[PDB]
Ligand binder design. Structure first.
Ligand SMILES: *[C@@H]1O[C@H](CO)[C@@H](O[C@@H]2O[C@H](CO)[C@@H](O[C@@H]3O[C@H](CO[C@H]4O[C@H](CO[C@H]5O[C@H](CO)[C@@H](O)[C@H](O)[C@@H]5O)[C@@H](O)[C@H](O[C@H]5O[C@H](CO)[C@@H](O)[C@H](O)[C@@H]5O[C@H]5O[C@H](CO)[C@@H](O)[C@H](O)[C@@H]5O)[C@@H]4O)[C@@H](O)[C@H](O[C@H]4O[C@H](CO)[C@@H](O)[C@H](O)[C@@H]4O[C@H]4O[C@H](CO)[C@@H](O)[C@H](O)[C@@H]4O)[C@@H]3O)[C@H](O)[C@H]2NC(C)=O)[C@H](O)[C@H]1NC(C)=O
Ligand SMILES: O=C(OCc1cc(Cl)cc(Cl)c1)N1CC[C@@H]2CN(C(=O)c3ccc4[nH]nnc4c3)C[C@@H]2CC1
Ligand SMILES: [Ca+2]
Ligand SMILES: [Ca+2]
Ligand SMILES: [Cl-]
Ligand code: NA
Ligand SMILES: [Zn+2]
Ligand SMILES: [Zn+2]
Length: 809
């Protein structure tokens, strides 16, 4: 209930959200149907449109007009945005040359440059090039300011998860807005686009920028705009707020446009009808800039032009139906569309079984346009599992496709008439889902292109731009310092928590009762002296190129040196946390010799009590083992023995060994050929609770049968070379190039529908899907890499957030 016969007089677009018995006048009152009776009349004036004309210049102020062309309008802050152009001989901001903004040029009384976020729904990254001719204002921002070729959204590439990630710096799994539609089983409540539930505080986690600002003494304009407030009114409202007295004026503002998304759904990303919406967005940007210029704020404010996601061609005919796969389709509830999420229709159904649903949806048609996953098996780069609002069963849908439960759902009720031609929500590495970023203003750089980056990084930057300390978030603060002229954030490397042991030779062979054997008793003072040197670290500068990784948690581990590789060996997890090695362009690939096929050798630096054992692998009929440093890449027959040490061994399912062996035997050498040498760091990951963070030892749910050997959930590798590939990886002078992956350690290859074929036809496709940022690996292992390079730490943070996507341009 709202008593709506209070009044909006003097309260239009009030910044505080009034609770009853009061009528509301904020920019969201329409949405709650809570506005005062006079809201339209007072706050949504439209008389005489939005532009001055010569006849209005110097008019007698008339309060019914939408905007003013009277002499007093500048003092009042309510001139039409073209007032000075029409009445005072000024030029439109777009027709002005750009001039570097080296410092803020702000009116007296401004304590910091304001920030305006101009968010545009569905603005696909390639619009910047393909619509350039019809968007002169935006092209000016783009070329004069700082821009990226594209900005990566979070998954799912839907509006509410992405706008709220922009505001918080958090993954959807952490901020809790995991879709536009959601069921929370703890509340037993549903969040929907239409209706009241979505406004409940309990949905919205983390701390959004407007709250971060308010808590730290910085006033914020309201971020959300009701659909029926015309864009011109939104602009004039921001301009009016910017004219408030110093003690009332906000420092941060958001504009939001429902376009081009709205038309994109109807016409497809590049339908001919898409030109008009782009022109109209451009015109609104022009109105903002002309308006800022009139107020002498166009060289004071920082403007961010950002989208939430892109837009793909998707039509009705491209729908897969679960009714074609499941006999039990009525027993499940599907969140449908460009992703799928499945749960039981009834929690009282004891015959609902997720393993059999998954199996019925796996590789059933040769052209199948979705792939089912338990959520913990989704590519770790999606960060889409650690929330009870994310169903256990997920369907990753192919770009251009939809999934639905039954055909009736599509031509009846919500799935639009078969009139829709575009949609979005797909995997966030898909090119059509990429969106835009431009920053323009005194705090941003001038005419500068920066590489593509992820939207989770922007919250930190918007905090830097406003002088705020950001709440804890998933950005890597400093990784975007290269966008900024000033206000950079200068982080320090995290401190090492555990120092390593460097064990020497301390055990005799006969102390090991591990059930291992090796044909290695075949038999010199040059060669004996040299092996000792290698075990003391004589080749470490070749194989550990960027320093040892730092261990950021309390643990017990050993550094082990060898001819061809160095490793940090956990006495707690009984295997390396990391193994580091460098492979030059000209390296030779060799085989595992026949006599060494089943060879495992005790490591006389490491206690039997801290070692794995071969008997456990023999007893475990499901589990085998592989090696972190690959025997295939040994520098010599004698060096190859080191690769068979029990301290280089890791538990691997036979189905996983197909993957890992092909990577080690074929792909590492291919990358070294292509990149002029690579340095590889590989290791295990334990994430049994799918929270993206290193498990403690008491979180491990599976061990090799009979033993204390924990089974990794994933294996990672980080492959680093010189960005200037004319320099070899081990003698690189400048910036680095990296690609990494986090492969799931699975006991079958059901994820790969072509896996009955030779590894050359499916392994690399699997690895590409599981591409990762170094930073993802850091969270998952509690290690910090690249500690000793000659690069600026900010540049190394950028490198750590890089994702190799394997999409084309
Ligand atoms: C991405 O970045 C984010 C942000 O850094 C990382 O997210 C953080 O991850 C941490 C580790 O998982 C986690 O620490 C938790 O926190 C528990 C307390 O959490 C509540 O309070 C949080 C703080 O609020 C205040 O924050 C600011 C400044 O810091 C203040 O100014 C304000 O006053 C704020 O109020 C709050 O953010 C948090 O929000 C979550 O929960 C809400 C309700 O469920 C949601 O609305 C909201 O969306 C958040 O939801 C996410 O996080 C939860 C987990 O917290 C997750 O379940 C959801 O799915 C979703 O992912 C809360 O309201 C604290 O109780 C925990 O401590 C227990 O566990 C640890 C280790 O497991 C124990 O050592 C500790 O003793 C304690 O154990 C006890 O409890 C156990 C479990 O119940 C029990 O088994 C045991 O026996 C013991 O009794 C733990 O420290 C952060 O909360 C989390 N923050 C956010 C926003 O997500 C994230 O990891 C990054 N991701 C990656 C990949 O890097
Ligand atoms: O003004 C808005 O936000 C501004 C903003 C900016 C920034 Cl930087 C951060 C944040 Cl936290 C908020 N809101 C108003 C409009 C809402 C209704 N929507 C749909 O109805 C919709 C749209 C596009 C869609 N595509 N597919 N379904 C859709 C549903 C979107 C919603 C966006 C939220
Ligand atoms: Ca076995
Ligand atoms: Ca974990
Ligand atoms: Cl297999
Ligand atoms: Na398969
Ligand atoms: Zn959107
Ligand atoms: Zn949309």
């Amino acid at each position: 209930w709202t008593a709506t016969s209070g009044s909006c007089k003097g309260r239009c677009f009030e910044l505080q959200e009034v609770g009853p018995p009061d009528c509301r006048c904020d920019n969201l009152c329409k949405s709650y149907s809570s506005c005062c009776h006079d809201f339209d009349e007072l706050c949504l004036k439209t008389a005489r449109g939005w532009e001055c004309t010569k006849d209005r210049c110097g008019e007698v102020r008339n309060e019914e007009n939408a905007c003013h062309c009277s002499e007093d309008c500048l003092s009042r802050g309510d001139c039409c945005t073209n007032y000075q152009v029409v009445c005072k001989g000024e030029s439109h901001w777009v027709d002005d040359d750009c001039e570097e903004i080296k410092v803020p040029e702000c009116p007296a009384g401004f304590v910091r440059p304001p920030l305006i976020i101009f968010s545009v729904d569905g603005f696909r990254a390639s619009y910047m090039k393909k619509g350039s001719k019809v968007m002169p204002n935006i092209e000016k921002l783009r070329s004069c300011g700082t821009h990226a070729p594209y900005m990566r959204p979070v998954y799912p590439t839907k509006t509410f998860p992405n706008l709220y990630t922009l505001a918080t710096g958090l993954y959807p799994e952490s901020h809790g807005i995991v879709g536009n539609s959601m069921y929370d089983p703890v509340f037993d409540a549903s969040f929907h686009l239409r209706g009241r539930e979505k406004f409940n505080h309990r949905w919205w986690g983390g701390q959004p920028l407007w709250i971060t600002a308010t808590k730290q003494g910085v006033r914020a304009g309201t971020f959300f705009w009701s659909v029926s407030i015309p864009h011109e009114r939104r602009i004039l409202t921001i301009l009016q707020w910017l004219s408030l007295p110093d003690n009332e004026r906000p420092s941060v503002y958001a504009f939001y446009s429902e376009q081009p998304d709205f038309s994109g759904h109807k016409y497809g990303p590049f339908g001919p009808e898409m030109t008009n919406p782009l022109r109209e967005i451009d015109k609104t940007v022009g109105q903002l800039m002309d308006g800022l210029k009139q107020l002498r704020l166009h060289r004071c404010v920082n403007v961010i032009f950002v989208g939430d996601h892109g837009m793909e061609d998707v039509t009705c005919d491209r729908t897969e139906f679960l009714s074609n796969y499941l006999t039990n389709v009525d027993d499940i509830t599907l969140v449908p569309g460009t992703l799928g999420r499945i749960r039981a229709k009834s929690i009282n159904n004891s015959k609902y079984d997720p393993k059999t649903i998954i199996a019925a949806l796996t590789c059933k048609k040769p052209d199948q346009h979705f792939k089912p996953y338990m959520k913990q098996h989704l590519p770790k780069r999606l960060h889409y599992a650690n929330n009870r609002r994310i169903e256990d069963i997920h369907l990753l849908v192919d770009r251009r496709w939809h999934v639905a439960r039954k055909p009736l759902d599509v031509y009846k009720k919500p799935s639009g008439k078969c009139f829709f031609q575009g949609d979005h929500g797909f995997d966030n590495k898909v090119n059509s889902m990429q969106t835009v970023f431009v920053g323009y203003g005194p705090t941003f750089k001038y005419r500068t292109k920066v590489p593509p980056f992820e939207n989770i990084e922007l919250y930190n930057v918007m905090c830097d731009l406003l002088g705020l300390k950001p709440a804890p978030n998933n950005g890597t603060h400093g990784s975007l310092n290269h966008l900024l002229r000033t206000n950079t954030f200068r982080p320090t490397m995290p401190d090492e928590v555990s120092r390593p042991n460097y064990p020497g030779i301390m055990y005799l062979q006969s102390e090991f009762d591990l059930g291992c054997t090796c044909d290695d008793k075949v038999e010199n003072k040059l060669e004996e002296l040299n092996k000792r040197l290698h075990t003391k670290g004589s080749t470490k500068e070749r194989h550990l190129l960027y320093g040892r990784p730092a261990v950021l948690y309390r643990t017990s581990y050993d550094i082990l040196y060898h001819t061809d590789f160095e490793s940090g060996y956990s006495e707690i997890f009984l295997m390396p946390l990391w193994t580091s090695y460098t492979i030059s362009k000209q390296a030779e690939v060799s085989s595992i010799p026949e006599h060494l096929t089943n060879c495992v050798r005790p490591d006389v630096r490491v206690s039997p009590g801290f070692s794995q054992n071969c008997l456990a692998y023999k007893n475990d009929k499901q589990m085998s083992y592989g090696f972190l440093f690959p025997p295939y890449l040994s520098s010599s027959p004698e060096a190859k023995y080191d690769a068979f040490l029990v301290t280089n061994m890791v538990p691997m399912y036979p189905a996983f060994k197909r993957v890992w062996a092909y990577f080690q035997r074929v792909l590492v050498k291919k990358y070294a050929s292509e990149r002029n040498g690579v340095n590889v760091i590989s290791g295990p990951i334990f994430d049994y609770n799918y929270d993206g963070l290193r498990d403690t030892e008491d979180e491990i749910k599976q061990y090799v049968e009979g033993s204390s050997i924990p089974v990794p959930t994933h294996y990672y590798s980080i492959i680093t070379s010189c960005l200037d590939f004319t320099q070899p990886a081990d003698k690189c002078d400048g910036p680095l190039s990296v690609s990494s992956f986090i492969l799931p350690h699975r006991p079958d290859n059901d994820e790969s529908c072509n896996s009955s074929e030779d590894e050359s036809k499916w392994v690399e496709e699997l690895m590409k899907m599981h591409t990762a940022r170094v930073r993802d690996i850091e969270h998952l292992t509690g290690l910090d890499f690249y500690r000793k390079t000659s690069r600026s730490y900010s540049e190394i943070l950028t490198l750590k957030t890089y994702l190799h996507t394997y999409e084309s341009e």
